[PDB]
Design a protein around this ligand. Structure first.
Ligand SMILES: [Zn+2]
Ligand SMILES: [Zn+2]
Lengths: 185, 156, 30, 78, 183
């Protein structure tokens, strides 16, 4: 019902467009499982903010929002968070989660890049629901504070350290099989 | 009424090998479904998209819709902030990833293609009151250190 | 921690439900 | 400043809205308690009250601290 | 039967007026700070700043002039409680003292105009007016009521006249009840 916006920092938009060029032009895919899961990044944000908040209600809200964003990463990574190519890798994990008889837990695998994607898509999502104005502003403030905290750690989770070392590169070149489904053959 | 299904997978707006729903003209790639459906093992019988499943589940009754969403919010009382949003995910079909328009227009050197190519040119109350008191103690201690620092620098 | 126990003590002392509702409305108006 | 309790607008045209945010709402002095009049539960009021108490305690502490730092500054000024 | 849809907050204001001018024995302090002249003029002005079509602005100014004339012709006849009339009468007498005729539009506040609007359904039901004109007038008054519902925090605030000053209402003395109420 309302009209709402997130003041996303510019460097996160730069990381987003760089990811877009890596996956769509360079034909790269994120290394799964990522070395830093979404559990780790969200837990670290929560644990580093919980030591700075005074009142109990603020911390209750922090924890509720963190757990909610965990549940949303889980429920949205398979729905809206992946481009055309990456879905293959996703289905790949599907088959693996099929053979291990273990339900897929998307949060324990992926990295902060897809969380950034979900956060950037969040405005339309929250705009399509009937949430009241005060809870909408609360969600938005929480997300913007989290975005600022993440921008403070822009290099630790997103910067490609030493592009000469393939072992730590976030994006790996897709095999000849992946382009087969990418060109629809 | 035998309606024609769209030759584009509504999740990726692309043409290819896709399975169609018998109650809506939307067709979807086998890799676009949630979970992605294997073209070797097809669901036997009448298959429907998520929207059709949710619709036939609620039987077009808005009262049932509100009842189920209220119960879903009541059950998610640890993540209540998201509760409403959550009830919307399992009802609607999936789509691929496209960043919002304002992110498209941040830098001028990047442009968009029609194919999607982008090109460059309880216990919890105890725990929370405990966190409260421990942070309060920490910061009043830091204030005491402020006073100690000021006193030591000014006495000299 | 002990403040949870304070609220339990208050609910015990007031005893009646309606008077506890009025007590909570006082608290929220504050 | 004046009232916080509205009229009782019956004829069954009153809006009961149970919020999706319960720990930092403001919403009225027009509460209704459950286990536009906005419903609420005991734990929400517990948390709002303790939030008020602790925020106020930190406020008073910071006031006393500003007083003491101004005092020590004017003291060493002598 | 013609019907008007007053906002609920304006209904609450009218009922609190019913309270004050009845057994709290209050009256409206006069001449009120914001009269019906000023209120209707500001409303017509702000809405004309938005109205593009000339016929729309003509209808706006026509309805506003008509409503001012109905204030002048109605405040005395049908818009005063039994408790208030003496005040009005007193002012009337003062007019005859200074030879300046009494036109209420410049003296009485928005609340009596809101009382007039409240009665206006029955008034228009006592007509032989055509349906489209009646509906046009109803829509004009409803747009006005929406404007008033936005400005009901600049206009209709309460101040408890027993303790500070200059409230929207003032108390009456015992002689006032004696003469006005129980003559
Ligand atoms: Zn597809
Ligand atoms: Zn379908």
């Amino acid at each position: 019902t309302p009209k709402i916006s997130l003041q996303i920092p510019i460097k996160l938009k730069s990381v987003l467009v760089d990811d877009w060029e890596y996956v769509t032009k360079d034909k790269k895919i994120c290394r799964l499982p990522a070395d830093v899961t979404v559990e780790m990044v969200l837990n670290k944000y929560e644990h580093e903010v919980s030591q700075e908040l005074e009142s109990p209600g603020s911390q209750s809200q922090l924890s509720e929002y963190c757990a909610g964003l965990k549940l949303y990463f889980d429920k949205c990574l398979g729905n809206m968070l992946l481009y055309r190519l990456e879905r293959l890798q996703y289905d790949e994990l599907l088959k693996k989660s099929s053979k291990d008889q273990k339900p897929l837990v998307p949060i324990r695998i992926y990295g902060a890049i897809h969380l950034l994607r979900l956060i950037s898509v969040l405005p339309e999502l929250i705009s399509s629901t009937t949430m009241d104005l005060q809870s909408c502003q609360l969600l938005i403030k929480q997300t913007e504070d989290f975005l600022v905290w993440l921008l403070m750690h822009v290099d630790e989770y997103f910067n490609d350290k030493d592009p000469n070392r393939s072992d730590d590169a976030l994006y790996v070149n897709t095999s000849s099989q992946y382009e087969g489904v990418a060109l629809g053959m | 009424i035998d309606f024609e299904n769209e030759d584009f997978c509504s999740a990726c707006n692309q043409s290819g090998s896709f399975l169609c729903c018998d109650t809506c003209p939307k067709s979807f790639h086998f890799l676009c479904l949630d979970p992605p459906i294997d073209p070797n093992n097809l669901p036997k019988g009448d298959w429907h998209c998520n929207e059709c499943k949710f619709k036939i589940f609620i039987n077009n009754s808005m009262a049932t819709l509100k009842k189920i969403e209220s119960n879903f919010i009541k059950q998610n009382n640890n993540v209540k902030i998201f509760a409403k949003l959550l009830f919307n995910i399992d009802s609607h079909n999936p789509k691929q990833f496209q960043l919002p328009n304002y992110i498209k227009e941040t830098f001028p050197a990047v442009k968009t293609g029609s194919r999607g190519q982008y090109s460059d040119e309880d216990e919890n109350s105890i725990k929370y009151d405990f966190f409260d008191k421990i942070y309060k103690s920490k910061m009043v201690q830091k204030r005491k250190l402020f006073q100690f620092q000021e006193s030591l620098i000014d006495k000299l | 921690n002990e403040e949870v126990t304070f609220f339990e003590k208050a609910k015990r002392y007031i005893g009646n439900k309606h008077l506890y509702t009025e007590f909570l409305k006082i608290l929220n108006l504050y | 400043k004046v009232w916080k309790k509205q009229r009782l607008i019956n004829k069954k045209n009153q809006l009961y809205y149970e919020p999706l945010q319960k720990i930092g709402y403001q919403n009225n002095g027009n509460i209704q308690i459950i286990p536009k009049i906005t419903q609420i539960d005991e734990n929400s009021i517990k948390y709002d009250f303790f939030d008020k108490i602790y925020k106020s305690k930190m406020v008073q502490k910071r006031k006393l601290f500003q007083f003491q730092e101004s005092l020590i500054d004017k003291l060493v000024s002598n």
